[PDB]
Amino acid sequence: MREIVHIQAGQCGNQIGAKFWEVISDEHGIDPTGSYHGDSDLQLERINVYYNEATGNKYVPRAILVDLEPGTMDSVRSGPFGQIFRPDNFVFGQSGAGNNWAKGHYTEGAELVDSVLDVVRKESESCDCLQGFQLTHSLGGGTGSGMGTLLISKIREEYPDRIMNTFSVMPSPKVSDTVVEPYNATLSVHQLVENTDETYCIDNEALYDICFRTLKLTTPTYGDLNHLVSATMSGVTTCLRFPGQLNADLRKLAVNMVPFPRLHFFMPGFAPLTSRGSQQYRALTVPELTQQMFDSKNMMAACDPRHGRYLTVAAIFRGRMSMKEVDEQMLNVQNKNSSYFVEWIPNNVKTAVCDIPPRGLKMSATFIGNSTAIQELFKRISEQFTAMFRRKAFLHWYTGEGMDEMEFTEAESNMNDLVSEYQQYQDATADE
Amino acid sequence: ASVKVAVRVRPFNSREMSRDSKCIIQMSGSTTTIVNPKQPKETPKSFSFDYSYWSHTSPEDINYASQKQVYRDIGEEMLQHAFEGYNVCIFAYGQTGAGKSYTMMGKQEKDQQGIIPQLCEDLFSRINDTTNDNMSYSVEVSYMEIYCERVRDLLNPKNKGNLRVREHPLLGPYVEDLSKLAVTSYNDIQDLMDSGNKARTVAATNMNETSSRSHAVFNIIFTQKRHDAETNITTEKVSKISLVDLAGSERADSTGAKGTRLKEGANINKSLTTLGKVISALAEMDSGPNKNKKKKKTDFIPYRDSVLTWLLRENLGGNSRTAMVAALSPADINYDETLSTLRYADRAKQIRCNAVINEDPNNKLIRELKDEVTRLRDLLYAQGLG
Amino acid sequence: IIDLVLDRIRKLADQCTGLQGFLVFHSFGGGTGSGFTSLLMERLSVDYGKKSKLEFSIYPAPQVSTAVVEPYNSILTTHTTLEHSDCAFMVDNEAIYDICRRNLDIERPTYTN
Amino acid sequence: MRECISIHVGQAGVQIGNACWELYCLEHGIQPDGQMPSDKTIGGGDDSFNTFFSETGAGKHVPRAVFVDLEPTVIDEVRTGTYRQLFHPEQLITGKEDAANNYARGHYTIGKEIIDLVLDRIRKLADQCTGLQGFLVFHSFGGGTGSGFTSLLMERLSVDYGKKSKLEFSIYPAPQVSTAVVEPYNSILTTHTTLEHSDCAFMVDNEAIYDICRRNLDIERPTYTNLNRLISQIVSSITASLRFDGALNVDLTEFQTNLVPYPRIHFPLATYAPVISAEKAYHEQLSVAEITNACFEPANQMVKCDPRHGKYMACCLLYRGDVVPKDVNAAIATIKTKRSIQFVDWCPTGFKVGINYQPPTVVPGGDLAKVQRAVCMLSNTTAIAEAWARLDHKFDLMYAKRAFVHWYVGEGMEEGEFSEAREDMAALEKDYEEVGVDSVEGEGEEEGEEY
Numbered sequence A: 001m002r003e004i005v006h007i008q009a010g011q012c013g014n015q016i017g018a019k020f021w022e023v024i025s026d027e028h029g030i031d032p033t034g035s036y037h038g039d040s041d042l043q044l045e046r047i048n049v050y051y052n053e054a055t056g057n058k059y060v061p062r063a064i065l066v067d068l069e070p071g072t073m074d075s076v077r078s079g080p081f082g083q084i085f086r087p088d089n090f091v092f093g094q095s096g097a098g099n100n101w102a103k104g105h106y107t108e109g110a111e112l113v114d115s116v117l118d119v120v121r122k123e124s125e126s127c128d129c130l131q132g133f134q135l136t137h138s139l140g141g142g143t144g145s146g147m148g149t150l151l152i153s154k155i156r157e158e159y160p161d162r163i164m165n166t167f168s169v170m171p172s173p174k175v176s177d178t179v180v181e182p183y184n185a186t187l188s189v190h191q192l193v194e195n196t197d198e199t200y201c202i203d204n205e206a207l208y209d210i211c212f213r214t215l216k217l218t219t220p221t222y223g224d225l226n227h228l229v230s231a232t233m234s235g236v237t238t239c240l241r242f243p244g245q246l247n248a249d250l251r252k253l254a255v256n257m258v259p260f261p262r263l264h265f266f267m268p269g270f271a272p273l274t275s276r277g278s279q280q281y282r283a284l285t286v287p288e289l290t291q292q293m294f295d296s297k298n299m300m301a302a303c304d305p306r307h308g309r310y311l312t313v314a315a316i317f318r319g320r321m322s323m324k325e326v327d328e329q330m331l332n333v334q335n336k337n338s339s340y341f342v343e344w345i346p347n348n349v350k351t352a353v354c355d356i357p358p359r360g361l362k363m364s365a366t367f368i369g370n371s372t373a374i375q376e377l378f379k380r381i382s383e384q385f386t387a388m389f390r391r392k393a394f395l396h397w398y399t400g401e402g403m404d405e406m407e408f409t410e411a412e413s414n415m416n417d418l419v420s421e422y423q424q425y426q427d428a429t430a431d432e
Numbered sequence B: 001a002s003v004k005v006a007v008r009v010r011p012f013n014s015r016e017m018s019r020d021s022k023c024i025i026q027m028s029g030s031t032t033t034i035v036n037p038k039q040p041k042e043t044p045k046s047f048s049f050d051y052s053y054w055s056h057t058s059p060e061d062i063n064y065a066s067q068k069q070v071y072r073d074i075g076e077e078m079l080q081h082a083f084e085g086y087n088v089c090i091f092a093y094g095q096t097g098a099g100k101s102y103t104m105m106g107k108q109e110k111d112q113q114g115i116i117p118q119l120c121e122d123l124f125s126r127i128n129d130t131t132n133d134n135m136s137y138s139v140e141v142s143y144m145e146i147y148c149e150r151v152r153d154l155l156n157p158k159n160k161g162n163l164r165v166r167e168h169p170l171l172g173p174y175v176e177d178l179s180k181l182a183v184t185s186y187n188d189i190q191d192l193m194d195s196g197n198k199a200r201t202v203a204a205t206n207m208n209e210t211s212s213r214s215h216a217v218f219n220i221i222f223t224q225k226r227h228d229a230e231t232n233i234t235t236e237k238v239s240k241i242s243l244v245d246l247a248g249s250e251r252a253d254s255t256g257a258k259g260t261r262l263k264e265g266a267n268i269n270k271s272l273t274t275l276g277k278v279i280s281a282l283a284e285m286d287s288g289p290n291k292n293k294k295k296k297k298t299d300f301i302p303y304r305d306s307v308l309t310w311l312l313r314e315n316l317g318g319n320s321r322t323a324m325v326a327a328l329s330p331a332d333i334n335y336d337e338t339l340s341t342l343r344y345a346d347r348a349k350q351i352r353c354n355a356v357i358n359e360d361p362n363n364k365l366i367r368e369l370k371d372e373v374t375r376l377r378d379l380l381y382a383q384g385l386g
Numbered sequence C: 001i002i003d004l005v006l007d008r009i010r011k012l013a014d015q016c017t018g019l020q021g022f023l024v025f026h027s028f029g030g031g032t033g034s035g036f037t038s039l040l041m042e043r044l045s046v047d048y049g050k051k052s053k054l055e056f057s058i059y060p061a062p063q064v065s066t067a068v069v070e071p072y073n074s075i076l077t078t079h080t081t082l083e084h085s086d087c088a089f090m091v092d093n094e095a096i097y098d099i100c101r102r103n104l105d106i107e108r109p110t111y112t113n
Numbered sequence D: 001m002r003e004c005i006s007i008h009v010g011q012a013g014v015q016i017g018n019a020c021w022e023l024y025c026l027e028h029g030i031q032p033d034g035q036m037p038s039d040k041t042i043g044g045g046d047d048s049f050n051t052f053f054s055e056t057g058a059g060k061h062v063p064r065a066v067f068v069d070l071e072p073t074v075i076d077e078v079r080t081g082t083y084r085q086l087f088h089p090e091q092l093i094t095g096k097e098d099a100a101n102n103y104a105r106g107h108y109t110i111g112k113e114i115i116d117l118v119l120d121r122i123r124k125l126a127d128q129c130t131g132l133q134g135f136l137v138f139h140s141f142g143g144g145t146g147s148g149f150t151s152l153l154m155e156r157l158s159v160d161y162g163k164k165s166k167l168e169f170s171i172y173p174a175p176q177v178s179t180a181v182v183e184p185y186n187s188i189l190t191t192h193t194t195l196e197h198s199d200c201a202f203m204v205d206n207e208a209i210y211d212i213c214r215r216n217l218d219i220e221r222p223t224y225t226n227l228n229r230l231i232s233q234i235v236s237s238i239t240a241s242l243r244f245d246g247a248l249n250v251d252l253t254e255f256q257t258n259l260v261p262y263p264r265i266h267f268p269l270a271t272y273a274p275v276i277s278a279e280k281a282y283h284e285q286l287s288v289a290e291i292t293n294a295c296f297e298p299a300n301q302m303v304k305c306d307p308r309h310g311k312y313m314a315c316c317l318l319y320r321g322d323v324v325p326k327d328v329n330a331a332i333a334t335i336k337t338k339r340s341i342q343f344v345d346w347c348p349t350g351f352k353v354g355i356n357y358q359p360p361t362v363v364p365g366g367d368l369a370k371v372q373r374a375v376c377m378l379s380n381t382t383a384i385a386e387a388w389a390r391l392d393h394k395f396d397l398m399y400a401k402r403a404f405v406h407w408y409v410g411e412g413m414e415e416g417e418f419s420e421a422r423e424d425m426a427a428l429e430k431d432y433e434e435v436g437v438d439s440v441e442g443e444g445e446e447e448g449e450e451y
Ligand SMILES: CC(=O)O[C@H]1C(=O)[C@@]2(C)[C@H]([C@H](OC(=O)c3ccccc3)[C@]3(O)C[C@H](OC(=O)[C@H](O)[C@@H](NC(=O)c4ccccc4)c4ccccc4)C(C)=C1C3(C)C)[C@]1(OC(C)=O)CO[C@@H]1C[C@@H]2O
Pocket: A022, A023, A026, A027, A215, A224, A225, A227, A228, A230, A231, A232, A234, A235, A272, A273, A274, A275, A276, A279, A358, A359, A360, A361
């Protein structure tokens, strides 16, 4: 029985995880107190993917909460679903990292990593057949990035055969909230490229653009961003929980999407999104979902796919629909946009179909792309990195905690090598 | 300088003698012929290499190559290159249970010793013989293994931890916290070699009773100094001698692996597959820019896909002179595998390195400017303007 | 899992009198339908040998497909489908979709048809 | 428990402390006698926030404050005032004369025999604290006590605690206005301690605050009470991130991680945007864009220096009240397109943002209008060099003739502590000039290999 251990780090990861546990909990029908009050018989069939079973017919999510500032933990406990989590999994300390990756990875997090790994081992030992992990955190921050990278390294050291997923929120061109985001982002990306099987890219700029242009909201908050992201996470792993005409495990996505080991940075997307005003106009059907999934403005990474090529894509549909229509639409998308797909991967579109849609919708779809345009994002960070590293803008904070220029240099070189490895396949006309 | 290529064929073992023992490998001059056992009507496909070696029969003289023969032909040449001040490497290749341990290490108790002992003994003899009042020599040793994408040190005492691979900005990849031991005599480095060979991870399989389970890299750092109180520069030359023994590719059906022995093999195959790509990639690039026009626009070599290719970034290409020793199996049943090695060997000679090797760039600039001054002064003197 | 499957097949064969053959249903492209089919056919050929073994397999379509690594899985089954199977029948999803669209006037067929 | 210990030195320090503690008592609903009837009315809570107040058994709340001065007058005004029962009776007041606008008198002669008691009480406060974040030291340049005793106390604290942050709020001498003839000497002699020991020093000017009061609040005849209330609002905006919940919380370490590129350039300016009278509170929207733009106006600066003559090195915005991230993002985006605001080329991000839900409070008898939104900006720039240079000139004009020097040497110093300080000022100005220069053109001179 496949099931997932869940880890949350930092403020962004903690909040996204809280919202995610509210969404999954609806689909499966779980009371905030922990009891089950569903209506369908298929909600409890595979509930063990996320939830352990307690004595009194309760269900406890298999989540791990990590931070160095206690305050966020309180915000989780004093909330709509604060009592659902078991208190033993609230692992935290004091004197947070303060947006310093060195404190998160080397000085402060090195003490709390033992306790976090203890709780992770305790959860993973009880697993019937542990599939893999998934971590939510922010690369541009402090405790989140550092402790996420450290935990990822330790877990890959101890569990080499299991899947290691990751949902990362990285910096943006215009949206910036810390002065030292490039250093943290560069070091985090250097750590992630080695020790991770899948990494979904999320950008606040793309989510705000979706909210303003697609959903037409006027005053979006972080709740809406968490809503979209949690919808994506629930969309990714639908097939482990519910039956379908053609299933798609996590390993199937990993195999079909990753041509070479270092190219595992994905662009996610979700459909439909209708703004609550145009819901009565559009007809809902497979062609509409196909059109919305591949639209450039619907992506969550703020990287235009038209500036590169799609190495691979995966489409996970939820709902009762015909397979012939899905296959025809995917073939049409391949054929019409002939110049945005690579010429040495015939039929580079993975397809999955699940028969149980979300509770309020007749149809839905999730899109996981893998394209060269992601290089742009890395290039941007690299540019900013140089602009601070050449003069050593803030390096004394990092070197005071037990680092040196050599780690910065090797991280920058690794990032540049990854950026070069994407471009290779980016240009057309492989001959000269 | 192009990569040097040696190939060698071994005699029959017990597995070959029990099954069909039909030979397919023939050798003549520099030419190695392989014949398809399934298609005798087909062409006898053949490859021309820099060196080929026939170790099937010892009494006869049909180009028979003892250990000393291959050692003179490759290792002595590459050691002479090292004395001139060039970083140098010899690495083995082929399939499981062919010739790597015999060729590089050999049987210590027997006279048929591998390349590494004979290179080390000749190096020690040459440094001891050529010692002078002004000349002086120093040598240092290290020996590492790659087990499952993890580096371990053999010469050091028991260290359960795994070392960390790092990147110096100028000198490229290296292994941090690697026990680099100073040595002074042939007996001491021989003891280090024996301890290192003992410390390696070896397991038994159907294909070979002593199938290696981990890649191995043996590094010797050599320093050549010339002392003068007036003009000469001390530490005139520094060289790195790298002997690499790679675990060969395996097939699960014939190997009979299960459990851990299977998983190890999988990693080994991964560490080989990437390596093959790198070789192929490298070849095409150093074939293309050299022959096509000279464009040098951009070519990516997947060095980082494995730790083995990462550590040997300067060895497979760049700042070193490299030799590749391929091990063959004469068994007919092995044909579909054996030919594969030859193909990569046939591409191995296409690779071309770029080695110059200097030291103390301040002294480099000073020497360049002083030589320019001397040349201009000589020109002025010859033409009557000095 | 192969040992348990062969044990159940042995029990069924022992129940059977004058067994004629095996009808094996699988699909190329999928990992299980390829690899486990190869294992099962090898072991069945070793054990029973003289009994007929018929395949009904879903070959990948020329244009539409549901995975990126279909050709590798399909090609690696050549040894199994050539040496061990006695007669293999191949069907294509595109052809049956066209049959449904043209003959049965079903515009949106699913796998049930 | 995000505990912070406040230290007040000198008359300016004590009066700013009075304003600050009035605001703190009003913020958490603490009465002047230390009781909190809010918990009794409600039933219980965490309203006794451990940042500033320590709760005893009987429901009383004692502030984490340390008042110090050499004159009995300034703190005897507090011992018999409205807040006499709030503070602990121990107030560390030397019943003797004062430093008398003399750095030497406050550092060497009379600063002794009072430093030991002060350090003892600071230790007693620190022992009660768990997870102490740092110190907040209030003083004033140009005064004898606030210069000399502050120097001594900072030196001893750096020796003892070391790794704890030590923020500084100080009143710099104005360019024209002054209240003493020997202000430059005392101001210059404190550079060694304000540089080597402090982690971040915030400077304010009385002329700038008087201009702000006259122009914005329409107060033609302000006194020091208004200035102290404005400074109290600034400090509360800084410290609110670790007392109340918010969308993005900024601790005192994120401050130093984001604002100071190098150890020797930790002198950021500060400013408060929605400084407006009650009558003018109407006729205005007071949106995020308006306050964020007003933070960058040179007229609103709290130090007499023009940011247009320098370059912005780092910025930290701290918002309070009904604010949302997207308005802040839009404000930053429209700010980055203005050519009058120049950032150093080596800090392309240039902004740190924090948001807190608690809106600012209104002190009865005050003059600031009640508002829904507010923002405090702290900006590390290079224009601050000008603020030093003028003062440096003044120092020379008095040291060429050795005027007023015999008072200083008669208390323990020699003339060399009077030059060393000047050389340190010169080196600091050279550093500020050097950091703001644009990177040299294609800083690898030029490049381009074959292909
Ligand atoms: C159809 C109808 O009458 O109401 C819809 C609706 O109007 C629309 C606009 C909904 C609505 O979504 C939003 O307004 C929204 C706002 C900010 C961020 C994200 C969404 C809806 O709120 C969202 C809500 O979604 C669900 O109920 C899904 O099951 C969703 N779960 C949750 O939203 C949820 C939130 C908190 C607690 C429990 C469940 C989900 C989505 C993917 C995977 C799993 C679950 C639905 C159907 C609707 C409303 C209520 C208007 C849409 O969202 C989703 C995810 O369905 C917007 O794009 C779709 C299109 C729908 O037509």
